Amino acid sequence: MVLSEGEWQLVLHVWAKVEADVAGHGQDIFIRLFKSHPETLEKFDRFKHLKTEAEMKASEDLKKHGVTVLTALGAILKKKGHHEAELKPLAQSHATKHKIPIKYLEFISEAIIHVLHSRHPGNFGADAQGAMNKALELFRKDIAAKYKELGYQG
Ligand code: HEM
């Protein structure tokens, strides 16, 4: 898929708001993911023991991880589709070390969209959400293609 420049400049406009508080947004997103899809928590040896949202909010380790995640994704979005180099190491670790099925990337996409909708209604009307959806779809289709080349595709 190709995004128009107008779609990228809906994506980067709302992303600029997220970047005012990267840790806060990272926490919201992971809690939403772990609540909506508990099976995903199982993939983190580091966080599997968290039982409640309170404990998730209280974890400084999860907060740090959310920051790493969003920083990496933000580096990707800012490339506007020219993200082949950034994707290679992420695909390799998620395919071979962590073993993350595409389906779970669909789940965190949903979590991201849910949090941007909740926190930034004014900058995330229908057109901006459609743009963000296309950007994340692009990300998932490119990572899926790398998964396949790497021998994981799943
Ligand atoms: C927006 C999509 C995501 C991005 C950009 C992302 C990014 C990252 C980055 C940069 C790291 C650290 C370096 C590395 O190991 O590659 C990481 C680690 C990790 N990721 Fe993701 N990730 C994503 C989605 C997921 C999902 C959906 C899952 C599981 C449901 C997952 C599971 C993990 C695990 C288990 C680790 C290692 C954490 C630890 O023990 O330190 N990731 N990810």
Q: How far apart are CA 29 and CA 23, in angstroms?
A: 10
Tokens 């997220």 found at:
18
| CA 97 vs CA 32, 130, 154: distances in Å | 24, 32, 14
CA distance 30 to 112: 9
Distance CA 64, CA 1 (A): 32
Query: Which letter does DSSP use for residue 97 in this model?
Result: I
Domain of 132, in residue numbers: 1-154
Q: How far apart are the C-alpha atoms of 68 and 101, rounded to whole Å? A: 20
* CATH number of the CATH domain containing 51: 1.10.490.10
Nearest to 17 by CA among 142, 132, 109, 134: 132
CB of 78 sitting under 6 A from ligand 1:
no
| Burial of 133: CB neighbours in 10 Å, binned 0-12, 13-18, 19+ | middle
Domain count, the chain: 1
Place of tokens 């023991």: 49
Q: In this structure, are residues 23 and 63 in contact, taking their beta carbons and an 8 Å threshold? A: yes
Q: What is the experimental resolution, given in Å to one decimal place?
A: 1.7
Q: Cα 54–55–58 angle (5° rounding)?
A: 90
Q: Solved by what technique?
A: X-ray
| Cα torsion 35, 67, 119, 75: sign | negative
Give me ligand 1 centre to Cα 97, in Å.
10
65 annotated among ligand-binding-site residues: yes
Please list, in sequence order, all residues whose beta carbon lies within 8 angstroms of the beta carbon of residue 89, skipping any fewer than 6 positions away.
Answer: none
